[PDB]
Design a protein around this ligand. Sequence first.
Ligand SMILES: C[C@@H]1O[C@@H](O[C@@H]2[C@@H](O[C@H]3O[C@H](CO)[C@H](O)[C@H](O)[C@H]3O)[C@@H](O)[C@@H](CO)O[C@H]2O)[C@@H](O)[C@H](O)[C@@H]1O
Ligand SMILES: [Ca+2]
Length: 128
Amino acid sequence: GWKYFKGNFYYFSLIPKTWYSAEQFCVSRNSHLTSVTSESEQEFLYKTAGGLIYWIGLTKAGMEGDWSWVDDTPFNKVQSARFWIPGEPNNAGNNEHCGNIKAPSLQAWNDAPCDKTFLFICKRPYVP
Ligand SMILES: C[C@@H]1O[C@@H](O[C@@H]2[C@@H](O[C@H]3O[C@H](CO)[C@H](O)[C@H](O)[C@H]3O)[C@@H](O)[C@@H](CO)O[C@H]2O)[C@@H](O)[C@H](O)[C@@H]1O
Ligand SMILES: [Ca+2]
């Protein structure tokens, strides 16, 4: 069921999990919760998500609580500004340290509590 896009395969889960249990599942399939590094990747992801909410690889790192990608793609604050839902990340209840794709729009991301269960998206490189 992996879907192909620009050199990567993507798994849109059928079972919901917490952010970390989702990441573990991804790692057990030689992948990671997905990073997003271009408008075209954001578009592919939210369109395929079809209006449902999916964990992606957004999580906090460092003392500052800077956003980061679990697959170790460097997080680009400037280039990623356009990808958040206006008002996010809002850190609601001061307990939102993971990120999902929520709205079917380029402005898609929301921060939400890591212990909440959602469907999730894994990303796995194709290596010829
Ligand atoms: C359920 C909850 O929804 C969001 O937090 C809401 C918040 O949502 C609005 O405002 C934020 C910025 O604070 C964003 O612009 C959203 O797009 C808006 O919909 C507000 O409704 C306030 C009002 O008291 O409540 C918050 O809980 C979201 O950020 C949370 O993660 C969570 O999903
Ligand atoms: Ca939020």
